[PDB]
């Protein structure tokens, strides 16, 4: 836990979901709810065109927020299973090294600021690419390369 | 007298203008509403 907070539900792995900025994230393809109690009451709003569920950070995490940015240089980006070298505009992994059950997963910068949120992944070699929703100058866009399987 | 035999699609002196005003009433603004539905369908669908 650098600033790493999680979603779980009922036995199934609900991917990952962390608070950031003003909103606790929730991807719309994720079924189930949070493991915790206090988070498990608020409202969502669905987005089919981008697959999201709007969900607000409660005020009790005023001393418990998580900063981020929208700065995308290339090179190494640390995640909870090591390093994803987001390079060439491409946040690839060596193929297959990630585990399913990772939908909505916080990748951060080289110093602990959340950069992107991953949904899917595919491969045509030793190069698994990923399907990721981002926020350019805090403007959110889903990006799906061809063949994204749910994590 | 048989001129009294009138149908139902008869003609007013002025209410043709009134139904011109009503048919040209709030149909234009909901045409604008449909237009901005077409606008907001293009959140990312336009220029490649």
């Amino acid at each position: 836990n650098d600033c790493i907070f999680e979603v779980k539900h009922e036995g199934k792995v609900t991917g990952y979901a962390c608070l950031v900025g003003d909103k606790v994230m929730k991807p719309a393809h994720v079924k189930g709810t949070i493991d915790n109690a206090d988070l498990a009451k608020l409202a969502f709003k669905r987005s089919s065109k981008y697959d999201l569920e709007c969900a607000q950070i409660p005020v009790h995490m005023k001393s418990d927020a998580s900063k981020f940015t929208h700065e995308k240089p290339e090179g190494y980006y640390n995640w909870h299973h090591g390093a994803v070298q987001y390079s060439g505009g491409r946040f690839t992994i060596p193929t297959g090294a990630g585990k399913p059950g990772d939908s909505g997963r916080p990748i951060f910068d080289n110093k602990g600021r959340v950069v992107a949120i991953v949904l899917g992944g595919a491969n045509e070699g030793a190069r698994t690419a990923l399907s990721v929703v981002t926020w350019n100058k805090d403007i959110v866009t889903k990006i799906t390369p061809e063949g994204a399987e749910e994590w | 007298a048989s001129h009294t035999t009138l149908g139902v699609q008869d003609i007013s002196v002025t209410a043709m203008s009134w139904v011109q005003k009503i048919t040209g009433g709030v149909g234009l603004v909901v045409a604008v509403a449909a237009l901005i539905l077409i606008v907001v369908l293009c959140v990312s669908f336009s220029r490649h």
Partner: protein
């Protein structure tokens, strides 16, 4: 009554738009991690109006 019908027809389309209007207020705004608004709601004018 048909006159009432068409007005209770017509604004229905409009309020359907208003439904979609709110459904497209959040569409630039949804889980937006800073949820920034220079002019995003200064033109819808539902909430989040800055000074002037």
């Amino acid at each position: 009554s048909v006159a009432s019908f068409v007005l209770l027809s017509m604004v229905g389309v409009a309020v359907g738009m208003c439904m979609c209007a709110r459904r497209r207020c959040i569409t630039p705004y949804e889980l937006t991690p800073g949820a920034t608004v220079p002019f995003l709601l200064s033109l819808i004018c539902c909430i989040r109006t800055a000074k002037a």
